[PDB]
Amino acid sequence: FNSNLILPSIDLAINILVDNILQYSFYKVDLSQCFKLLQSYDQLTNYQYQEILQTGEDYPAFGPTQRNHMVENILKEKIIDIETQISIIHENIEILLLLIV
Amino acid sequence: KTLVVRNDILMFLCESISTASHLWCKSCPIESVDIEILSKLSNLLAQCSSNPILGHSISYHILTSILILVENTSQHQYIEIKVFNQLINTLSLFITEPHFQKKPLPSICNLSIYLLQVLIDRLDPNALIAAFPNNLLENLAKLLKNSLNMVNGNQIDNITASSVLNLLISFCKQPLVSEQLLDNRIIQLLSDHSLKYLQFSMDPYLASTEISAATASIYGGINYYFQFNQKKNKWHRVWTLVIKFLISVSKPLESSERFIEQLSNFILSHKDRLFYYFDLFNEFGATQHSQYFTKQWFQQLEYITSLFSIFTKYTKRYYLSMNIYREFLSLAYRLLVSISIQCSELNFIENNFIPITKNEKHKNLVQ
Amino acid sequence: LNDLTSSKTPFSNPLEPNVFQDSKINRKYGLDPKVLAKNLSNINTSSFTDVIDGYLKVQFENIILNTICDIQKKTSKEFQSHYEQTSIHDWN
Amino acid sequence: LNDLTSSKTPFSNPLEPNVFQDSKINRKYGLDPKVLAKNLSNINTSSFT
Numbered sequence: 176f177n178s179n180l181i182l183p184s185i186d187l188a189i190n191i192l193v194d195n196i197l198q199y200s201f202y203k204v205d206l207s208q209c210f211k212l213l214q215s216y217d218q219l220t221n222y223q224y225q226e227i228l229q230t231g232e233d234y235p236a237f238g239p240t241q242r243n244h245m246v247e248n249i250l251k252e253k254i255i256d257i258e259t260q261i262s263i264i265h266e267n268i269e270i271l272l273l274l275i276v
Numbered sequence: 277k278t279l280v281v282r283n284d285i286l287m288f289l290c291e292s293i294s295t296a297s298h299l300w301c302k303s304c305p306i307e308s309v310d311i312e313i314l315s316k317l318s319n320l321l322a323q324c325s326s327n328p329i330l331g332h333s334i335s336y337h338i339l340t341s342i343l344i345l346v347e348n349t350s351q352h353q354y355i356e357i358k359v360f361n362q363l364i365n366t367l368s369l370f371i372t373e374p375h376f377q378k379k380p381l382p383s384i385c386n387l388s389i390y391l392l393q394v395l396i397d398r399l400d401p402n403a404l405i406a407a408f409p410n411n412l413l414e415n416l417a418k419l420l421k422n423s424l425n426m427v428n429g430n431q432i433d434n435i436t437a438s439s440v441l442n443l444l445i446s447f448c449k450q451p452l453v454s455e456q457l458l459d460n461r462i463i464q465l466l467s468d469h470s471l472k473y474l475q476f477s478m479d480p481y482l483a484s485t486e487i488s489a490a491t492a493s494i495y496g497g498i499n500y501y502f503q504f505n506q507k508k509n510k511w512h513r514v515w516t517l518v519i520k521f522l523i524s525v526s527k528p529l530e531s532s533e534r535f536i537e538q539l540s541n542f543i544l545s546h547k548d549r550l551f552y553y554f555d556l557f558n559e560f561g562a563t564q565h566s567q568y569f570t571k572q573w574f575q576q577l578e579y580i581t582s583l584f585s586i587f588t589k590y591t592k593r594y595y596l597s598m599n600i601y602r603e604f605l606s607l608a609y610r611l612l613v614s615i616s617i618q619c620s621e622l623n624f625i626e627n628n629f630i631p632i633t634k635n636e637k638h639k640n641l642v643q
Numbered sequence: 644l645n646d647l648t649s650s651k652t653p654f655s656n657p658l659e660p661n662v663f664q665d666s667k668i669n670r671k672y673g674l675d676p677k678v679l680a681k682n683l684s685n686i687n688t689s690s691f692t693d694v695i696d697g698y699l700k701v702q703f704e705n706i707i708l709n710t711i712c713d714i715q716k717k718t719s720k721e722f723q724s725h726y727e728q729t730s731i732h733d734w735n
Numbered sequence: 736l737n738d739l740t741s742s743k744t745p746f747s748n749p750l751e752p753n754v755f756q757d758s759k760i761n762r763k764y765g766l767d768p769k770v771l772a773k774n775l776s777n778i779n780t781s782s783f784t
Contacts (some may be wrong), residue, residue: 196656207650295699298706340707349712390674390711397718442718484689505692547697582730613715635712666773677768681752 176274185222185275199264206257213250216243283331293317299340301315301348309349311356313462317342317358322366335370345395359503360395361407367392372415382432385419389439396446405452413453413460418439419507420462424514434510437473441517448524455532457525463538466585467519467545477511478552508633516572517578526586536590543587547600553580556605557614568630581611 176185212219212227225234227246237245264265295370317338325336349355374380396404422428423436444462445489447453457463487507520537529535542548553576584604595601616626631637655661669675747753760769 200656202652204653290698294703340703343710344706347710387707390714393718397721408687445722446718464714501694504689505694523726524722582726662776664744666769666770675769678754678758679736681754681757684750686753 185248188271188275191198192268192275195264195267195271199261199268202257202264206261208255209250209254209257213247213254214244216250279307280329280459283329283354285336287331287334287337290334290341291612293480294341294344295335297344300345307350309345309353311359313363314345314355315359317345318362318366322362325369326521328376332384336381336384336387339370339391339528343387343391346391346398349398349577351398354397354400355398357403357407360399364392364407364409367395368409368412371419372411375435379428382428382436386435386439389443393439396443401450404450408453413456413462414442416443417460417462417465421465421468422470424473426472430476431510433473434514437514437587438510438517441514441521445517445524446592448521449526451528453527454525458529460534463522463525463535463540463542464471464523467482467538469545473511473514477509477515478549480512480570481506482507482509510520512572516579519576521581523579523586539583539587540595543583543600548581550580551603553577553606554611557610569628570631570632571629571636577611584608621636 176183176188178185180186212223224242224246227249228234228237228242229239297587321335321342324330324338337345346355346451370384372394374385420437420440423433423440426433428436445458447457522542526535526539553573584607588604631640757768762783
């Protein structure tokens with residue numbers, strides 16, 4: 176990154192740092208939603224069960240014990256997906272601070 | 277020689293003798309105490325002091341039974357010298373020889389000190405001199421240095437130092453014992469800045485924040501599980517007793533240059549601690565919150581100004597050449613100005629002075 | 644509920660406190676950090692105060708403690724009369 | 736004048752700040768300490784060319 180505030184200039188590293196700080200704040204609220212869903216899965220609305228399972232006009236057919244097991248494992252996967260992206264984006268923030276300095 | 281089982285049975289009996297002795301004195305006004313009961317208990321105490329297999333709790337109940345009989349004598353009953361000198365030796369043993377290890381129960385040494393003080397505060401003045409154990413002042417001075425260094429913990433030694441200083445204040449009723457207080461160096465000992473209780477004896481109270489800081493900085497281990505009411509300082513009472521001791525010792529010793537010397541040396545070491553009680557009258561002149569000036573603090577000034585009124589009776593020219601005589605003149609003028617203000621403001625004396633504790637309130641209610 | 648509701652508020656970056664919205668909210672509901680925290684400073688830990696065999700023990704301890712308290716009243720009159728008597732004789 | 740008036744105000748200890756006094760004074764003279772704060776937070780170095 177060049178000096179200015181051809182190569183790109185250091186405005187690029189600062190804007191990428193801000194967007195990664197914002198995404199790191201979002202995924203930590205979103206993880207704080209996925210762990211709340213996993214702590215109340217037998218007490219979610221039928222609309223939240225449609226919001227997670229999305230199984231078309233088949234959605235009526237599935238029994239409660241079936242839906243609850245399917246949502247409990249979809250929430251395990253999506254917590255692991257999110258905790259992985261939270262690592263990668265924290266490390267982007269440390270790399271960008273190091274590059275700017 | 278053969279059964280420990282006799283100890284706890286004798287303890288359950290001394291518990292019962294103690295219970296019955298109290299219930300007798302609290303029920304019959306004693307025109308004359310039973311000298312055979314006092315003799316039987318004096319021998320049983322002397323036997324318990326000869327035999328370290330007998331549990332200290334037995335001796336504590338016998339001492340309690342004797343104390344409850346002794347101050348309930350009428351003020352015209354003198355005790356028989358044969359029973360008194362038997363008691364004074366056994367009471368000296370519980371003061372000279374504390375460490376037979378397990379530590380002793382410090383309540384026994386203190387209870388023996390109170391029974392000894394009560395016996396002094398009942399005698400022919402001329403009889404105490406004919407019953408005095410020579411080693412008693414030397415080992416009371418060791419017990420005082422050890423308790424003013426807190427060697428058994430901040431609440432135990434505070435009671436020990438308090439009790440020894442009251443016993444010493446009752447000994448100051450006698451000239452020849454007060455002469456012995458100078459050569460047992462008990463003023464030179466009270467001039468000593470190595471005595472840990474000095475750190476804990478500036479203020480009449482303790483703050484909320486001191487009590488965690490001054491325990492966490494000491495107890496780094498040994499994991500035993502277990503309107504504002506300001507915790508009036510227990511070591512300030514020891515400072516009040518030290519200043520009262522000097523005001524008793526001065527009276528038989530109006531000719532003693534060793535008293536004038538050791539008093540000058542105490543006034544030299546404790547100078548600015550003795551001045552703090554006067555220069556606080558500058559600090560309240562602007563922004564200090566209206567603290568409830570206690571009768572105990574005005575009595576500390578009654579005592580310290582009397583100590584200066586005593587010192588100004590004896591000072592040879594060499595002391596008048598010290599800045600301390602310019603400083604005492606300054607303190608006397610500061611305090612006379614601030615008192616001339618407060619004695620015009622009679623309203624300051626009628627709003628700000630509250631009798632605080634359950635015992636201060638009780639003394640007003642009794643009188 | 645503090646942990647839970649904090650995990651529901653989208654608070655801005657603490658470098659970007661939305662003073663336009665805060666000055667709406669702290670006049671709408673009447674909330675005031677410069678009055679609320681100003682009461683709270685004046686409410687500290689020192690604003691608050693505390694107020695068979697065990698019976699035979701507590702009675703025995705009371706017997707000793709009152710006896711020692713009354714000896715400490717006796718010597719407390721004796722010293723004082725003797726002090727004020729000497730304090731008079733000195734000027735005579 | 737900030738130095739010469741701040742040295743004339745007997746400000747309380749900032750750990751004992753008297754609630755009722757500013758609650759009178761600010762509503763008397765109009766010194767709303769959220770309005771005055773917003774009207775200052777939206778003035779910065781980047782407000783002047």
